[PDB]
Structures are given as C-alpha cells and as structure tokens.
Scaffold this active site. Structure first.
Site, PDB file in Angstrom:
ATOM      1  N   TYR A  50       0.847  -1.192   0.000  1.00 18.47           N
ATOM      2  CA  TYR A  50       0.000   0.000   0.000  1.00 18.47           C
ATOM      3  C   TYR A  50       0.880   1.237   0.000  1.00 18.47           C
ATOM      4  O   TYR A  50       1.848   1.297   0.767  1.00 18.47           O
ATOM      5  CB  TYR A  50      -0.955   0.023   1.213  1.00 18.47           C
ATOM      6  CG  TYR A  50      -1.590   1.381   1.560  1.00 18.47           C
ATOM      7  CD1 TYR A  50      -2.317   2.117   0.619  1.00 18.47           C
ATOM      8  CD2 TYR A  50      -1.478   1.905   2.838  1.00 18.47           C
ATOM      9  CE1 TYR A  50      -2.901   3.345   0.948  1.00 18.47           C
ATOM     10  CE2 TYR A  50      -2.063   3.111   3.179  1.00 18.47           C
ATOM     11  CZ  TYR A  50      -2.769   3.841   2.245  1.00 18.47           C
ATOM     12  OH  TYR A  50      -3.319   5.052   2.644  1.00 18.47           O
ATOM     13  N   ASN A  52       0.594   5.761  -0.898  1.00 19.28           N
ATOM     14  CA  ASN A  52       0.102   7.031  -1.437  1.00 19.28           C
ATOM     15  C   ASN A  52       1.211   7.618  -2.289  1.00 19.28           C
ATOM     16  O   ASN A  52       2.215   8.084  -1.753  1.00 19.28           O
ATOM     17  CB  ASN A  52      -0.251   8.031  -0.337  1.00 19.28           C
ATOM     18  CG  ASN A  52      -1.493   7.650   0.462  1.00 19.28           C
ATOM     19  OD1 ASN A  52      -2.490   7.159  -0.081  1.00 19.28           O
ATOM     20  ND2 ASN A  52      -1.438   7.901   1.767  1.00 19.28           N
ATOM     21  N   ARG A  96     -12.764   8.674  -7.605  1.00 20.27           N
ATOM     22  CA  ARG A  96     -13.557   8.940  -6.415  1.00 20.27           C
ATOM     23  C   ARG A  96     -13.073  10.213  -5.729  1.00 20.27           C
ATOM     24  O   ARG A  96     -12.057  10.805  -6.109  1.00 20.27           O
ATOM     25  CB  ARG A  96     -13.501   7.728  -5.456  1.00 20.27           C
ATOM     26  CG  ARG A  96     -12.197   7.607  -4.669  1.00 20.27           C
ATOM     27  CD  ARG A  96     -12.065   6.330  -3.773  1.00 20.27           C
ATOM     28  NE  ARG A  96     -11.084   6.620  -2.725  1.00 20.27           N
ATOM     29  CZ  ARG A  96      -9.865   6.076  -2.618  1.00 20.27           C
ATOM     30  NH1 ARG A  96      -9.444   5.128  -3.458  1.00 20.27           N
ATOM     31  NH2 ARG A  96      -9.061   6.472  -1.628  1.00 20.27           N
ATOM     32  N   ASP A  98     -12.407  11.555  -1.624  1.00 21.48           N
ATOM     33  CA  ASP A  98     -12.368  11.278  -0.187  1.00 21.48           C
ATOM     34  C   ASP A  98     -12.382  12.595   0.568  1.00 21.48           C
ATOM     35  O   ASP A  98     -11.759  13.575   0.134  1.00 21.48           O
ATOM     36  CB  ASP A  98     -11.136  10.499   0.235  1.00 21.48           C
ATOM     37  CG  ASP A  98     -11.078   9.116  -0.362  1.00 21.48           C
ATOM     38  OD1 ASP A  98     -11.789   8.829  -1.364  1.00 21.48           O
ATOM     39  OD2 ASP A  98     -10.285   8.312   0.174  1.00 21.48           O
ATOM     40  N   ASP A 129      -2.936   4.794  -4.491  1.00 20.19           N
ATOM     41  CA  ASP A 129      -3.816   5.932  -4.740  1.00 20.19           C
ATOM     42  C   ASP A 129      -2.996   7.078  -5.329  1.00 20.19           C
ATOM     43  O   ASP A 129      -1.879   7.335  -4.873  1.00 20.19           O
ATOM     44  CB  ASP A 129      -4.509   6.410  -3.448  1.00 20.19           C
ATOM     45  CG  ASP A 129      -5.753   5.582  -3.080  1.00 20.19           C
ATOM     46  OD1 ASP A 129      -6.369   4.936  -3.962  1.00 20.19           O
ATOM     47  OD2 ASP A 129      -6.139   5.580  -1.894  1.00 20.19           O
TER      48      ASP A 129
END
Ligand code: NA
Length: 146
Positions: A50, A52, A96, A98, A129
């Site tokens: 994961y 960013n 999307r 957030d 992301d």
C-alpha cells in the site's frame, strides 16, 4: 456535500459494478469511513503493498496495518464518493473523492483520487492511490517521509 461532475459516465457508475473484485473494492473503500485499521486490515493478503504516490510504500500486512492505524489517529475519513469503478488485466480502478477532517483542527479537505487495486483470491495484493499531496502534509499531522 459533493456534486456529480460533468464528466461522470453512467456506463461505469458505482451502482453498476459487475465483477466480484469490483464489488470487493467498492465495499472496501466504502468501509474507509469506519476509521478502523483493525476492520480494514482483514481485506489484505499477507504478501501485499500500500502506497500514497510517491511517498515511501508499505510492503506486507504489518506495515500496511501500522500505517493505516497511524492515519486514523490524526484524521477522520468522513465521506467517500465513488464516481467510476472498473477493472482490467487483474486490476481494479476507482475514480472517487475522499473527505478528510483533521482531528486537531477540525478543518476539512476534499481529495480527488484515482486508485488502483490488485487482488489474489479475493484479498488485496496491492493498492496505490494517486492524488495531489499539496494539502496532504497540512491535513495529516505526521511528518511526510517523502
Ligand atoms: Na459495470
């Protein structure tokens, strides 16, 4: 409250998800608002990742869990509106928004995100992301390591 953008396509809308991996990923990013790293880590495989982009990545379930848990002590995820979801070659994409609220200031931020996910046997093998991090430093009360 967020509005539907002009470029939103109905053919790829969130309510039209039509594969298992898409339904898992939409469930996951909707669970973000739980603000609970214990619930969220159950979706990940042991060999996983994961990031960013392009901050230092987390590799492996323990690092993913630790970074999630650190985020949720300085920031609340108030909304996640998904405008598009889709998939190809074993990857899933979410276009999307957030909404993050800084717990020590109460200030709110809208981030426009395009995220890519990879699953093995229903579990997350990778999650990256992409968004503008200009306000991210001020919004998360943690030293950026990149
Ligand atoms: Na679809």
């Amino acid at each position: 409250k967020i509005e539907q953008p002009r470029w939103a396509s109905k053919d790829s809308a969130a309510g039209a998800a039509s594969t298992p991996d898409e339904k898992i990923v939409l469930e996951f990013v909707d669970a973000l608002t739980s603000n609970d790293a214990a619930k969220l880590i159950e979706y990940f495989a042991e060999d996983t990742m994961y990031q960013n982009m392009p901050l230092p990545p987390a590799y492996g379930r323990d690092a993913v869990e630790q970074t999630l848990a650190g985020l949720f002590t300085v920031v609340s995820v108030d909304a996640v509106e998904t405008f598009h979801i889709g998939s190809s070659n074993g990857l899933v994409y979410t276009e999307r928004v957030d909404v993050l609220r800084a717990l020590p200031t109460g200030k709110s931020y809208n981030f426009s995100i395009l995220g890519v996910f990879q699953l093995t046997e229903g579990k997350i093998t990778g999650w990256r992301d992409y968004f503008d991090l200009r306000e991210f430093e001020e919004a998360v009360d943690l030293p950026l390591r990149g």
